[PDB]
Amino acid sequence: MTLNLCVLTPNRSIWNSEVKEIILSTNSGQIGVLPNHAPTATAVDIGILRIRLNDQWLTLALMGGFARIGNNEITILVNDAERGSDIDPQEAQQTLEIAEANLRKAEGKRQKIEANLALRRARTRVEASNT
Amino acid sequence: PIIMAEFLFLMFALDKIYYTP
Amino acid sequence: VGQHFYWQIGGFQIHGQVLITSWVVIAILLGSAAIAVRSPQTIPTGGQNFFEYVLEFIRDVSKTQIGEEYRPWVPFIGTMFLFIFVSNWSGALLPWKIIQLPHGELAAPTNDINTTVALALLTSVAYFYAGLTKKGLGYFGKYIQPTPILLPINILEDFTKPLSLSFRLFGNILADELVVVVLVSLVPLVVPIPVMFLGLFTSGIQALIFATLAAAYIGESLE
Amino acid sequence: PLIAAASVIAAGLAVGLASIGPGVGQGTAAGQAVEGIARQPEAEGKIRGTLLLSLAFMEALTIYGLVVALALLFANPFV
Amino acid sequence: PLIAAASVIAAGLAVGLASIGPGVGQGTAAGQAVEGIARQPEAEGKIRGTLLLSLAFMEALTIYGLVVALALLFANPFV
Amino acid sequence: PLIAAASVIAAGLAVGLASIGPGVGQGTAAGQAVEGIARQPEAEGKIRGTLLLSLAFMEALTIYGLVVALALLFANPFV
Amino acid sequence: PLIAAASVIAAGLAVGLASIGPGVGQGTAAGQAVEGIARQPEAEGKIRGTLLLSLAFMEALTIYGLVVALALLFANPFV
Amino acid sequence: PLIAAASVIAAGLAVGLASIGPGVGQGTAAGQAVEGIARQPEAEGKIRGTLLLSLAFMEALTIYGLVVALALLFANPFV
Amino acid sequence: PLIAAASVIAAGLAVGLASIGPGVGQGTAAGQAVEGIARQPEAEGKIRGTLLLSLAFMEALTIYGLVVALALLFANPFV
Amino acid sequence: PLIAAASVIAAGLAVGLASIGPGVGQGTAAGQAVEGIARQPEAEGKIRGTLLLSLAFMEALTIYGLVVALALLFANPFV
Amino acid sequence: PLIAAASVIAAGLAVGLASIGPGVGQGTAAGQAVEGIARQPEAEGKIRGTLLLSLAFMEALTIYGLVVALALLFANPFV
Amino acid sequence: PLIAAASVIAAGLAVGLASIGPGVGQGTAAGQAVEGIARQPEAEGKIRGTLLLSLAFMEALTIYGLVVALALLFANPFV
Amino acid sequence: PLIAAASVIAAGLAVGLASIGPGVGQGTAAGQAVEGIARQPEAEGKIRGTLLLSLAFMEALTIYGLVVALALLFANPFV
Amino acid sequence: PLIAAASVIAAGLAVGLASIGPGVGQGTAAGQAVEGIARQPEAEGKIRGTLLLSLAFMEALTIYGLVVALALLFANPFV
Amino acid sequence: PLIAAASVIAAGLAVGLASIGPGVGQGTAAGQAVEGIARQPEAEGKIRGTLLLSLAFMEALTIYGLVVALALLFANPFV
Amino acid sequence: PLIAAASVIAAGLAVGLASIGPGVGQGTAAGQAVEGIARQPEAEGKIRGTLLLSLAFMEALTIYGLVVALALLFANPFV
Amino acid sequence: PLIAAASVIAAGLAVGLASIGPGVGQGTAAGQAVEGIARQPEAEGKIRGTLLLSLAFMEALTIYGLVVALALLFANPFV
Amino acid sequence: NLINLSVVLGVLIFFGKGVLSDLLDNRKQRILN
């Protein structure tokens, strides 16, 4: 009743099941996909990939990557996608406080980009583990 | 004038008789 | 074509269209609301379903806009929605060319000055009162911290916004009256058939946009 | 006299400069609508909703102009 | 005199300037519609339905201008 | 007198140059609106609401012009 | 007399200002249509049909201008 | 006389040549606002607040034009 | 007579303003046609059909302008 | 004296030709500002601050037009 | 008298407001044609076929204007 | 005397045209300024500095328009 | 008298408005041609051929107006 | 008389048409300069240098217009 | 006489509208030519060659305008 | 006499038109110049030299306008 | 006499509409030339040579306008 | 007014209830299930 969806980290296929409604947080913002979407191959930011199983709305925790929409056979090549919600938010905020802390000490030019990406990944981790 | 007064009466009365139920 | 008044003196020269149209439209609106709220069931039955659908519409458009305390202004904005709705439908439907009046005409409440400027004035009184309520009593939203120039323009916009909404209602309902009167004055009414649909659509969405524009401005009063 | 001639010039130019704007208006609005229809064949109903709504508003613009010209021609107070 | 001259010149310019708007309108709209078809053939019917509705509305602008021009031409109550 | 001709020609120019402007505004507004519906339907209510609001403001501009247009056409104290 | 001259110049500017717009409209629509049929060879029939419908509505606008030009030219109830 | 009627001619011409500007501006702001409602529907409330600031300044512009546009017809301190 | 003067000026302006549209349309249309031929060397049959058909449609537009001019010039029912 | 009529026409044209430009100007400004707050949900304070400064300057432009037109209408040294 | 001078002014303006068109027409057509040439030179034959055909139709428009200007010059049926 | 009418119409057109250009100037300026503010949360200080310099310069241009209008109105050396 | 004066005004207007368009046309064709040549020089003979043919057709489009103006200045069979 | 009044209208139109273009030019230069500043915040010194140089050359254009207007107002060697 | 005044005004507007459009053409051609020079320094020679042939034929157009306008000025066979 | 008035109108109009175009010329030149400077601040010397060359040339355009205005106003051989 | 007034108006409009086009031309040429230098500063000499050639071609067009103006002003055979 | 208005009266009594009934059916099946 929907398009084929395969979320694929480098090492494995996370899960290749099909679900109805997906909100794809791109570099251009959130975009919703439909079953029988016309093919759009976009990018994906360090953000939130929300799905909809037509029975319950669920979020997926990913750390970036790339997406492709095809003839109802869509493939999303991600960086670090942990299936569903595997973590609880207490250790998430224990990672948020230390990421914002080490942002200060990591102040050199490369450490700017490094701490900023660690921050954008901790923020997507916590806003994925809210549910 | 009396149109404003009648609008006010209509709205207070209709509120009381019509909204919370 | 006769829109001024008739000489039913009551202390001052008062408009006749204003009086009779607004009085009868308020009367039929309260007759619709009151007789069907006498015996309501817990299930949304025949008319109660329609009335509760209207009221949850007002609940949504009042919950999304203003702030944390829109519910006491839900009666005001909801009676405003109902007034504009039924007055637009009565102007589109209720026959007032077969009935003749010796001194003037009788088409709708918003055709004249009084029952649009009264809506503007009541909303503006509500905005000033709600601003002196939610904010302090020394200086309302006029006071300029960041810019040393916006002090007069603050009261100037607080003066020119209600009249602007009034002129919106003017340019809607007077235009609709012109459409209907010239379109029935063309020839027998075989021509108004496609135009009636556009008039109905515009009248309904006119009611909706007046509702959300009242909501936005009590939102500014809250802000 | 001259008032009817000037009035009907006003009506003709009124209809022309009514059809100026809503033309390109409905053009861009409906073009984006029919493109986004191919982009999403699932919210076709809501695309039709916003499309009919906005197209009807631009038809309302041109009927504003049409009715002020129609009152200049047929139902006018002066001449 | 000058009244019928004004009437016919008003009708000519009224049917004239009624065109530039809906022309580029229908142009861009049909371009985005055919691009939608070429990007996906599956929603041809909904594409062409919203397309024809918008086209009947640009043509509604056009026939509005035309009926003012023709009632200006033939059934001119002034002269 | 000719003052009526002056008033009505000013009315025609007023309503025409009024109906020119906000039509393409409504157009590009509705166009980015339908592109937004095709992009993400999860805020369909907000897209519909802001559509209603901004189209209302644009028709409001045109009728801000139209009230003076009808004051010069129909209800004039000058003539 | 001047009325005939006014009717002929009205027909001339009628076909002119009626022919300015749908030209560029037809151009944009057909350019994107040929780009679409160059992109995909499957939907050619539906593309050509819908383009024929839209381009013929544009021709309908221009022939509305043409028949105002012809009615002002041949049979005017003023001249 | 013509010297006083130039005031109402200037009134019609003024409102006509004033109202054109805010239409495309309201349309651009509305389009980018609803495109933002499409892109990020979470911060859309703050976007609506900035849209309220935009509506405030746009309505300020247009109503401040309308006050003097009506002052042309109402108050003639010249004559 | 001034009738024939305005008539031939009408033919001149008719062909002038009937030639501005189809030129500025066929330009982008045929440019995108060659662009699509350069996109895919297989759909050239349908691209040729659509391009020649639409460029002949704008040919038809400019010859509508030309036949208005030639009816004004050769076969003038008034003069 | 004709100086009063020239003054009132100059005031009307000043208001119109000062209301043309800044309208689409502030539209572009507010459009890119709402697309910006749509991109980032964080820098909204500086967005509102800089947009308020630029909108105040554009209001200053239109109010420049309005106050010189007011010095034309009420407080003019010539008439 | 006035007839031949009016015919000659009409011919001059006709060829001028005609050549303001297909100039930019042929320009954009040839620009996109040569861009497609240096993008895909695989279909040079069909590219040049469409190029010559398009440029010939623009030449057809401009020579329509040219032959009607020539008929306004040489064989004026009035004078 | 005609010199006062000339002075006031010249001042009105001067202020109108001087408000025309910097409108869209400041429009694109504020649009790209807030787009930069939105893309980067770092350099609000110097972005505001350069934006304020450009705004003060363009408003110096529109007060060039204002001072020439005022010198025509009050401190008119001819009357 | 006035006929030869009208002929020379017509010639000047003809060459002016026949010189506007082809300049822009030749320019955009040249720009796209040189962009394509920088992208890929492999068909330099073919590129030169197609571009000189396009420039020949645009210079034909303007030499049309030039020879009609020389028929207006040197050998006018009316005067 | 007429010489001084024409000098006044000339000065007003001069300052207007020399104020329009600098508006849009300075605005687009300012917007793109601020976007470039957001692109790199490192060399804002040189960015400011070239921005102020171009802004001051455009301001030199506006004060060229200002000084010819002031010579047309005060230091008029004719009258 | 009026014939020589016609000649001089025709030559002025002839050089004017000979100068309007070729400026835009030469600009877009030159800018995209230097864009190609910086894109690829391998096609440099025939980049130069196409630039030269193109700007030379556009110069042929503007000198066509120059020579017809100087034929209106210095060697007039009529007056 | 009318020669002085015609001269002063031509001079004001001349400096206006000769200023208005190079304005947005220098504006787009400066916009792309600073956007390129923030692209790479290495070539800043040659960048500034070339933009100075072009800004000197557009200022040469506007001082050509200025010097013909001065030659028309002060050192005029006729009046 | 009227001949000198016509000659000076033609001269002023000649300088204006002569400097108009080269302004935007030179501007676009400069902007894309400096963006090219910022893209790759390798061929700075070739780029500067083509830039001076292009800007000098536009200077040639405005020098054509300048020498036509100087013929109208100083060595005018008519006046 | 007789047959002119009758088509939109029929459109009301049928189509308005038809478009209200499906959304009411969705909300009733929601609350009941």
| HEC secondary structure over chain N | CHHHHHHHHHHHHHHHHHHHHHHHHHHHHHHHHHHHHHHCCCCHHHHHHHHHHHHHHHHHHHHHHHHHHHHHHCCCCCC
CA-based nearest residue in chain C for residue B15: C75
H helices of chain H, in order, are 2-39, 44-74
> Which residue from I20, K62, K28, K58 is spatially nearest to M25, judged by alpha carbons?
K28
> Which residue from H10, L22, L75, N19 is spatially nearest to J60, judged by alpha carbons?
L22
H30 token code pair: 């509305």
Burial label for N8, CB within 10 Å (0-12, 13-18, 19+), is buried
What φ, ψ does residue A60 adopt, rounded to 5°? -125, 135
Residue P65's alpha-carbon distances to C211, J27, N62, P53, in angstroms, are 57, 34, 13, 19
Verify that A42 and A82 share a domain, yes or no: yes
d(CA G19, CA I22) in angstroms, rounded, equals 8
H helices of chain L, in order, are 2-39, 44-73
d(CA H10, CA A113) in angstroms, rounded, equals 61
3-state secondary structure of C99: coil
Chain R interface, best mutation among C54, C186, C196, by max R CB count within 10 A: C196
- CB distance I31 to G30 below 8 Å: no
> Which residue from L30, R2, Q62, P58 is spatially nearest to J31, judged by alpha carbons?
L30
- CB distance L57 to N51 below 8 Å: no
d(CA A26, CA P22) in angstroms, rounded, equals 42
DSSP letter for each residue of J27-61 = HHHHHHHHHHHHH-SSTHHHHHHHHHHHHHHHHHH
What's the number of domains chain H is made of?
1
A44 token code pair: 């994906």
d(CA C70, CA L19) in angstroms, rounded, equals 42
CA-based nearest residue in chain C for residue F46: C64
What's the number of domains chain A is made of?
2
D57 token code pair: 């508003």
3-state secondary structure of A9: coil
- Cβ-defined contact of C53 to R20 (cutoff 8 Å): yes
Verify that A29 and A60 share a domain, yes or no: yes
Nearest to Q32 among O20, O34, O70 (CB): O34
d(CA N30, CA L53) in angstroms, rounded, equals 9
H and O make contact (3+ CB pairs below 8 Å): no
Verify that A17 and A65 share a domain, yes or no: yes
Instruction: Walk across the sheet containing A43-44 and list its strands.
Output: A13-15, A4-8, A73-78, A65-68, A43-44
Contacts of G75 (CB under 8 A, 6+ apart): none
Contacts of A55 (CB under 8 A, 6+ apart): none
Nearest to D22 among E11, E50, E61 (CB): E61
d(CA C60, CA M38) in angstroms, rounded, equals 59
d(CA I11, CA G64) in angstroms, rounded, equals 18
d(CA D25, CA H28) in angstroms, rounded, equals 12
d(CA K75, CA C106) in angstroms, rounded, equals 66
What one-letter code names the amino acid at C162?
P
The b/e string for O12-31 (b: 16+ C-beta within 10 A; e otherwise) is: bbbbbbbbbbbbbbbbbbbb
3-state secondary structure of G43: coil
- Cβ-defined contact of G57 to E26 (cutoff 8 Å): yes
> Which residue from D16, E15, I16 is spatially nearest to G72, judged by alpha carbons?
E15
- CB distance E79 to E4 below 8 Å: yes
**Which chains pack against A, by 3+ Cβ pairs within 8 A?**
D, E, F, H
- CB distance G25 to E25 below 8 Å: yes
Contacts of H51 (CB under 8 A, 6+ apart): F50, H29, H33, J34
> Which residue from A41, C186, O65 is spatially nearest to M14, judged by alpha carbons?
O65
> Which residue from F3, F10, F7, F19 is spatially nearest to F65, judged by alpha carbons?
F19
3-state secondary structure of L16: helix
Residues of L in contact with J4 (CB under 8 A): none
Q: What interhelical angle do M3-39 and O2-39 show, nearest 10? A: 0
User: Residue O72 CA to chain centroid, in angstroms?
Assistant: 18
Q: Does R29 touch chain C (CB under 8 A)?
A: no
DSSP classification of residue F41: G
What φ, ψ does residue A7 adopt, rounded to 5°? -95, 125
**Which chains pack against H, by 3+ Cβ pairs within 8 A?**
A, C, F, J
Secondary structure element (H or E) that encloses residue B8, with its range = helix B2-18
C-alpha dihedral (A34, A37, A39, A45), degrees to nearest 10: -10
Secondary structure element (H or E) that encloses residue J66, with its range = helix J44-73
D42 token code pair: 């699932």
Residues of I in contact with G22 (CB under 8 A): 21, 25, 61
J11 token code pair: 């005031």
- Cβ-defined contact of O72 to M2 (cutoff 8 Å): no
> Which residue from K25, L1, F43, C53 is spatially nearest to A29, judged by alpha carbons?
F43
C86 token code pair: 């039924």
Bridge partners of A48?
A61
Residue H35's alpha-carbon distances to A28, A61, K2, K16, in angstroms, are 11, 26, 59, 43
d(CA E24, CA H31) in angstroms, rounded, equals 20
SS (H, E, C) chain K: CCHHHHHHHHHHHHHHHHHCCHHHHHHHHHHHHHHHHHHCHHHHHHHHHHHHHHHHHHHHHHHHHHHHHHHHHCCCCCC
Question: CB J32: neighbour CB atoms within 10 A?
Answer: 25
User: Residue R3 CA to chain centroid, in angstroms?
Assistant: 21
Nearest to J27 among H26, H42, H64 (CB): H26
- CB distance D51 to E52 below 8 Å: no
R17 token code pair: 């209830």
- Cβ-defined contact of L22 to N25 (cutoff 8 Å): no
- CB distance O51 to Q51 below 8 Å: no
**Which chains pack against D, by 3+ Cβ pairs within 8 A?**
A, C, E, F
- Where do we find the tokens 């605005």? N27
- Cβ-defined contact of O37 to Q16 (cutoff 8 Å): no
- β-pairing verdict for A4-8 and A73-78: parallel
> Do you know the residue count of chain K?
79
> Which residue from Q67, K69, P17 is spatially nearest to M11, judged by alpha carbons?
K69
Kindly state the greatest CA–CA separation across chain P.
61
> Which residue from Q45, Q38, Q42, M41 is spatially nearest to O49, judged by alpha carbons?
M41
d(CA K32, CA O33) in angstroms, rounded, equals 15
Q: Which domain covers residue M14, as residue numbers?
A: 1-76
- Cβ-defined contact of P39 to N36 (cutoff 8 Å): yes
Using only C-alpha atoms, chain E has a radius of gyration, in whole angstroms, of: 18
Residues of L in contact with J25 (CB under 8 A): 23-28, 30
SS (H, E, C) A55-91: CCEEEEECCCEEEECCCCEEEEEECCCECCCCCCHHH
d(CA Q26, CA O25) in angstroms, rounded, equals 10
d(CA O16, CA O5) in angstroms, rounded, equals 17
J44 token code pair: 């909204």
> Which residue from L4, L5, L57 is spatially nearest to L26, judged by alpha carbons?
L57
Q: Does J45 touch chain H (CB under 8 A)?
A: no
CA-based nearest residue in chain A for residue E40: A38
First to last CA, chain E: 10
Nearest to P9 among N9, N25, N26 (CB): N9
d(CA J10, CA L8) in angstroms, rounded, equals 6
DSSP classification of residue A38: P
d(CA M37, CA K36) in angstroms, rounded, equals 11
First to last CA, chain C: 42
CA-based nearest residue in chain C for residue J63: C153
- Cβ-defined contact of D41 to E42 (cutoff 8 Å): yes
- β-pairing verdict for A30-33 and A43-44: unpaired
Bridge partners of A44?
A65
Using only C-alpha atoms, chain G has a radius of gyration, in whole angstroms, of: 18
Residues of K in contact with M8 (CB under 8 A): none
Question: CB C193: neighbour CB atoms within 10 A?
Answer: 13
Chain E residues 47-66 within an 8 A CB cutoff of chain D: 47, 50-51, 53-54, 57-58, 60-62, 64-65
- Cβ-defined contact of L13 to N11 (cutoff 8 Å): no
- Where do we find the tokens 């002066």? D78
- CB distance N15 to N33 below 8 Å: no
CA count, 13 A, side-chain hemisphere, O75: 5
- Where do we find the tokens 């694109």? L28
- Where do we find the tokens 């006491």? C72
Verify that A121 and A105 share a domain, yes or no: yes
Strand residue runs (E) in A1-130: 4-8, 13-15, 22-25, 30-33, 43-44, 48-52, 57-61, 65-68, 73-78
3-state secondary structure of C189: coil
CA-based nearest residue in chain Q for residue P60: Q59
d(CA M20, CA C190) in angstroms, rounded, equals 51
M51 token code pair: 């571009």
E58 token code pair: 């640009």
Nearest to F32 among D22, D32, D65 (CB): D32
> Which residue from C6, C214, C4 is spatially nearest to C101, judged by alpha carbons?
C6
d(CA H25, CA O31) in angstroms, rounded, equals 31
Chain L interface, best mutation among J7, J26, J66, by max L CB count within 10 A: J7
DSSP classification of residue F43: G
- Where do we find the tokens 């010397």? P45
Kindly state the greatest CA–CA separation across chain O.
60
Nearest to O4 among Q3, Q22, Q39 (CB): Q3
For residue C140, is it left (φ>0), alpha (ψ between -120 and 50) or beta? Answer: beta
The number of helices, as runs of H, and strands, as runs of E, in chain P is 2, 0
d(CA I40, CA M18) in angstroms, rounded, equals 36
Q: Structure resolution in Å?
A: 3.3
d(CA Q22, CA R14) in angstroms, rounded, equals 67
- CB distance A11 to E12 below 8 Å: no
A105 token code pair: 């000490």
Q: What interhelical angle do D3-39 and E20-39 show, nearest 10? A: 10
- CB distance E38 to G37 below 8 Å: yes
First to last CA, chain A: 26
Q: What interhelical angle do C192-222 and F44-73 show, nearest 10? A: 110
DSSP classification of residue L43: -
Report the sign of the C-alpha dihedral through residues K53, K58, K59, K63, in that order: positive
- CB distance N16 to L33 below 8 Å: no
Residues of H in contact with J59 (CB under 8 A): 57, 60-61
Instruction: Give Q16→chain O minimum CA distance, Å.
Output: 7
Kindly state the greatest CA–CA separation across chain C.
63
C-alpha dihedral (I21, I22, I27, I32), degrees to nearest 10: 110
> Which residue from H68, L31, J59 is spatially nearest to C154, judged by alpha carbons?
J59
d(CA D18, CA F14) in angstroms, rounded, equals 11
- Cβ-defined contact of O15 to Q17 (cutoff 8 Å): yes
- CB distance F18 to F65 below 8 Å: yes
Report the sign of the C-alpha dihedral through residues D39, D45, D47, D52, in that order: positive
Instruction: Give J53→chain C minimum CA distance, Å.
Output: 9
Q: Which domain covers residue A120, as residue numbers?
A: 88-131
- Cβ-defined contact of O47 to M38 (cutoff 8 Å): yes
Chain Q residues 2-41 within an 8 A CB cutoff of chain P: 2, 4-13, 15-35, 37-39, 41
- Cβ-defined contact of D40 to A35 (cutoff 8 Å): no
Residues of A in contact with F43 (CB under 8 A): none
For residue A35, is it left (φ>0), alpha (ψ between -120 and 50) or beta? Answer: beta
The b/e string for C200-209 (b: 16+ C-beta within 10 A; e otherwise) is: bbbbebbbbb
A14 token code pair: 């996370």
Question: CB J42: neighbour CB atoms within 10 A?
Answer: 12
Strand residue runs (E) in chain M: none
Question: CB C129: neighbour CB atoms within 10 A?
Answer: 12
D and E make contact (3+ CB pairs below 8 Å): yes
> Which residue from G66, F69, G12 is spatially nearest to E66, judged by alpha carbons?
G66
- Report chain D residues touching chain A, CB-CB < 8 A: 38-43
Instruction: Give C146→chain H minimum CA distance, Å.
Output: 15
User: Residue O29 CA to chain centroid, in angstroms?
Assistant: 13
Instruction: Give K34→chain I minimum CA distance, Å.
Output: 9
Nearest to I21 among G21, G33, G79 (CB): G21
DSSP classification of residue B19: T
C10 token code pair: 């009551």
d(CA D36, CA N16) in angstroms, rounded, equals 44
O49 token code pair: 């060659």
d(CA C69, CA D43) in angstroms, rounded, equals 34
- Cβ-defined contact of B21 to C55 (cutoff 8 Å): no
Burial label for A51, CB within 10 Å (0-12, 13-18, 19+), is buried
- CB distance O41 to Q43 below 8 Å: yes
Instruction: Walk across the sheet containing A48-52 and list its strands.
Output: A30-33, A22-25, A48-52, A57-61
- Where do we find the tokens 């108006």? Q9
Chain M interface, best mutation among K34, K54, K63, by max M CB count within 10 A: K34
CA-based nearest residue in chain K for residue I21: K21
DSSP letter for each residue of O14-73 = HHHHHHHHHHHHHHHHHHHHHHHHHH-TTSHHHHHHHHHHHHHHHHHHHHHHHHHHHHHH
P and R make contact (3+ CB pairs below 8 Å): no
**Which chains pack against C, by 3+ Cβ pairs within 8 A?**
B, D, F, H, J, R
> Which residue from D13, J2, D11 is spatially nearest to H5, judged by alpha carbons?
J2
Q: What interhelical angle do N44-73 and P44-73 show, nearest 10? A: 0
- CB distance C139 to C191 below 8 Å: no
- β-pairing verdict for A48-52 and A22-25: antiparallel
